Design a protein around this ligand. Structure first.
Ligand SMILES: c1cnc(Oc2ccc(-c3cc[nH]n3)cc2)nc1
Ligand SMILES: c1cnc(Oc2ccc(-c3cc[nH]n3)cc2)nc1
Length: 211
């Protein structure tokens, strides 16, 4: 059947939709379709290209209030790519507290982690029951499932600037050094390449967590 209303969604609403590039973009909800128990959402992007999307692949174009966000909430967030910024899907790992200077910790679908503000987040419209089950990468999906279900039990390595450790990259161990700590994240310098990466302190990419 063709609907005009479905829960709190209304045909003609402005919304965000997931493109095949896996980045999210502004569009208009132009149709809502049912096939038995299933729903699909037709989005016209602001370039006139159109997609028929599942409800876990559309997001509201507004910033969610803090009492609506939990550990495990499915969101779209501002993602830093060199000198460019995109909107990319993730999971809420931490809500604002004194130890994280009142920020949200996001685990992105590709395994990147970063702290963001409330003005950098958007809520996905119809998340799955198990919110991690639409993460495509098996290693990221399994890690997120274990993290969200074990919370608040969170094993982490206590690290200090200057400490020498081994860090995983492309399947092998690399000589590295702790450059900085920010809450649950550590900035690692890869010593041979002389470039840095922010990594979650409970990641198995840090040799002390692997062991
Ligand atoms: C495939 C999986 N999930 C959905 O939507 C659901 C969303 C939430 C729940 C639920 C039940 C108890 N708590 N949350 C169930 C279903 N649709 C397709
Ligand atoms: C926050 C941090 N990490 C993830 O996912 C991953 C975790 C571990 C690996 C990995 C690769 C080789 N060894 N461990 C990859 C991805 N997701 C949220």
């Amino acid at each position: 059947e063709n609907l005009y209303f479905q829960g709190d969604l209304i045909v003609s609403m402005r919304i965000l939709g997931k493109k095949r590039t896996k980045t999210w973009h502004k569009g208009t909800l132009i149709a809502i379709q049912t096939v038995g128990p299933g729903k699909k959402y037709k989005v016209k992007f602001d370039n006139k290209g159109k997609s028929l999307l599942s409800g876990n692949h559309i997001a509201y174009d507004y910033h969610p209030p803090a009492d609506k966000l939990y550990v495990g909430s499915r969101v779209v967030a501002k993602y830093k790519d060199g000198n460019q910024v995109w909107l990319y899907a993730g999971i809420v790992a931490e809500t604002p507290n004194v130890k994280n200077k009142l920020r949200f910790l996001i685990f992105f679908d590709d395994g990147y982690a970063s702290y963001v503000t409330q003005s950098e987040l958007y809520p996905i419209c119809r998340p799955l029951k198990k919110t991690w089950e639409d993460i495509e990468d098996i290693s990221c999906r399994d890690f997120i499932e274990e993290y969200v279900t074990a919370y608040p039990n969170r094993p982490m390595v206590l690290l200090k600037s200057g400490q020498l450790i081994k860090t995983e990259w492309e399947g092998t161990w690399w000589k590295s050094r702790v450059e900085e700590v920010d809450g649950s994240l550590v900035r690692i310098l890869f010593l041979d390449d002389k470039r840095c990466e922010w990594i979650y302190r409970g990641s198995t990419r840090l040799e002390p967590m692997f062991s």
